[PDB]
Enzyme design. Sequence first.
Site: not given
Lengths: 546, 546
Positions: B334, B465, B523
């Site tokens: 990720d 982010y 995921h």
Amino acid sequence: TLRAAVFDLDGVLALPAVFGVLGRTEEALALPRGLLNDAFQKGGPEGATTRLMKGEITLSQWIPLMEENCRKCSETAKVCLPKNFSIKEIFDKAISARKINRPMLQAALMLRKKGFTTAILTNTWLDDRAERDGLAQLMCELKMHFDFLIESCQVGMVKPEPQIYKFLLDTLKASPSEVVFLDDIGANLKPARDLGMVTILVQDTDTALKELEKVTGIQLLNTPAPLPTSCNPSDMSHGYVTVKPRVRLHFVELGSGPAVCLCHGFPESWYSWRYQIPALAQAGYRVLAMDMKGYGESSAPPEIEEYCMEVLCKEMVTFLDKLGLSQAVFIGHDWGGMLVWYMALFYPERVRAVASLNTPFIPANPNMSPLESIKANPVFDYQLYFQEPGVAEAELEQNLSRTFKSLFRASDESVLSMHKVCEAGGLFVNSPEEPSLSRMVTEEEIQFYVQQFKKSGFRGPLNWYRNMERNWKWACKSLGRKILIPALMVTAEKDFVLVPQMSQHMEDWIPHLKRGHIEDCGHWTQMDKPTEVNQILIKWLDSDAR
Amino acid sequence: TLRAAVFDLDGVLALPAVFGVLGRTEEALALPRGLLNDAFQKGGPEGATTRLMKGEITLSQWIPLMEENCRKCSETAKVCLPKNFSIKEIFDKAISARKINRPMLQAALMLRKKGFTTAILTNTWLDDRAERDGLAQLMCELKMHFDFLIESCQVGMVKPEPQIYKFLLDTLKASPSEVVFLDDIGANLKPARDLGMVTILVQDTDTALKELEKVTGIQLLNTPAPLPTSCNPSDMSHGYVTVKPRVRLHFVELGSGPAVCLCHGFPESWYSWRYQIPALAQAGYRVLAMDMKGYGESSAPPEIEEYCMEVLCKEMVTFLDKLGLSQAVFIGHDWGGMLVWYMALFYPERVRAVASLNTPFIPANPNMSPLESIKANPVFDYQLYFQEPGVAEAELEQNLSRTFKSLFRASDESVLSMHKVCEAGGLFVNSPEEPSLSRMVTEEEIQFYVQQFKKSGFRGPLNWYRNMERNWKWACKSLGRKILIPALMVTAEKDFVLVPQMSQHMEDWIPHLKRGHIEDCGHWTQMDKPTEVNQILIKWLDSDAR
Ligand SMILES: CC1(C)C(=O)Nc2ccc(-c3ccc(F)cc3)cc21
Ligand SMILES: CC1(C)C(=O)Nc2ccc(-c3ccc(F)cc3)cc21
């Protein structure tokens, strides 16, 4: 007044220059003079090499562009490149031949020690070659000794462009008149000079260092042999392993390669190995410098039995189990030296090799009590003072700075009457309240030990001496064994307690035992003679520990 | 009722039996039957082998005594041992050929999982052979899965002596009727049987396991494929490195060999690699499982800019510098997967090899804002919800157990509406307050993440982010480069955000890229399909990471 020194990499901190291989190859292959150096600089600021040095492209993308330039240059000069010409081969050999310029690094180290801000400013590339690790290793060793490392490929600017010089000044937070700039390329010195910086054109190191000492007013050439690199506790990787519910072991970790577990003595710390850790890691080992049970950041339970050799050794095996290490080289000093011999005797499958500083291997005498055996030698009297719980703790904990300043002294600075401790009523009865600082230690190094011992005191550390009967009974189980794994015994000429002659019969129980000997070395071996300890250990590790 | 199971080593947990080589050598060399087995047991309780097994002598001291016994036996049988007969060679080969009996270990693992106390009871020796590490490795792998390991040479007692059995019972803190004892030697079962223990004579594993399941009432044979070994946080070695004044990085460390640095994603922990750490260490690597900046025991400064890729990568380089590592293999998932590609692009000299789980490498588009690019794909909408400081922190920190139980679910258990997060006003608006426990996780594993996130919350993790423009500008500097070091891309069929097709153009920028693909994988790759992740990573490490 100067307060910053800047060094180039190729031709200054690292020799021979990678650039100079273009000339040597021309001579070896009998190619027209300057042909390879011409194809290298082809296109100038718009050329392939400039794009490489700015980080626009990687070294592997650049190799075919250089080959293409080498062809165009040969076509103009009406010559033909040989059957098997390889830019990859030429540069692979050139990069691996380049080593640190030791006296240049020594000067940078000396300037930084005197308050200078130091930096490396270099025109370099992004290396993605299969053999890039060699250069990664070189950059790692060099950079640690400097405040800043400015690489052209990371900043997108290149020497001689004026912007990189303005970027350097901003990084240094210094006016150009405060800066000495050393470079082997005259064109690259020019903008630094034009800005007002002191510049040294580096051809031979010796002349460059004379110019450097004249301008700084600091002796850099002919200066005495420097100590090995030490450790800054706040810059180390700190590890923690729980070996049982109430017991955690702390260690400092540095390097890659075969695991080397360092075991200090009494009353010490992982920091006693400060001069060995960077050296052994640089020699190609993964160093694990312990805080032994009872010390520093490791747990210190109060029970005497928590410190017998059987328990200590079992816990060290669990330490390896939890880290996923099938083996480790065990190197010990003093009580750590005693632990490592019993690790070799009881857990040989877990001990890659064993080395002891000062501590000989002497088997248990099954026909005599350990208390009797220790009374025979008057040098071991101080260990009887350690027997009564609370007595030695009180004197050692009374004034920590006095304790460490009194203990950590060279053979010709001793302040302690080792005889007859119990009778005199203590270790420091004829010792000063404010001992002078030994030539082996700084005030800051003493203050590190003082801060470490504030946590748990001397109970756990003294408990190592309080299991003589338990250790004797356990050691008697090993009386029919021999130590047959690789082993090294290092003796210290001037250790008046752990005397070199006490190790004389060791070959009877370790037939293939290797030896080292340090002249004019007291008990505090690692800090007394660090350069020689490192030479002996690295030599023995490379030959016997794989 | 049974509550303890005891297993022998040779012929039970490890096959082929080292004993059986004495017979095979006899047949290979055409020596009289039982000749080598006779010289091995020569003198019985007073013999050389008994002294060896009790720890009186080491394996290297025993070798010439066995040779001396082999001669005396051959002299009696009126035979001659061959020109080049070597007990050392015979035993070196026998020991290295002996491997773990996987189904026997699986049964012991299953019994311990059901509340049984398990132990290994073995007649063994102190191994000081040059090749002792092979056996040290085997004992390390086996012992971790058991409550106790009782070795004859460490306790000074041997099977079939009655005292070792009384010692075992005391160690187990159990009555003999509560114990199952498995051994391949009938004589060694006998005292356990006579004491009232359930005994299984082990010839073939299958029959022994049938007897074992019949007596315990626990299914051990034909049982489903077990998960790989996980990590108990309290039993790991924990490391701490200060990379800058306000920033410390925490990691868990296991194994020896080339350093493998594991980099988790959002919102995870070092513990997300729990099923990989023991496996990669066992495959011959030094695993360093990070708590990435902003997580667990690592520092979590509040500033958004502390979490841009440039800063994160620089800090990871310093992490290597402080540990003394010139290189490491970088494996990420990720956000960790994104970091590892930029480590390969900006610091190839420090990256031995690079692997990413789910996260593709997609170069920056210099003709489009990263905010624009992310709006194009509706699956990335949830990342826009993360932009406003404080909004996602409040919802994610509201109920930690609900957060982790909602997130960590397989592809066919999903409870989240990933569209349209901002519009709906949150990630968990159509999600239950008390989500059911996913089949991938236990309550205890969720509670570990809950406890970790109690320290710093979600600010630092969400800040990863919040640097899209900063990361885009930095990434554009790498647009002319290629990744040419060893690289692996692992795709997950059912990751609905980091879809396998997003990685399709990667070969344009990583020409020698290797691939792995996991079917029916969501995921949360590491915990969703641990066995397959381990197979893909170990295979790629052994071939491309040296
Ligand atoms: C310096 C001197 C005599 C020497 O030559 N060998 C040794 C060995 C141990 C101690 C020592 C260690 C701790 C302590 F508290 C007191 C003395 C002191 C010495
Ligand atoms: C399970 C699902 C849809 C999938 O298939 N791919 C991804 C990627 C990220 C998140 C995710 C991570 C953190 C968070 F807070 C919310 C969602 C969730 C998913």
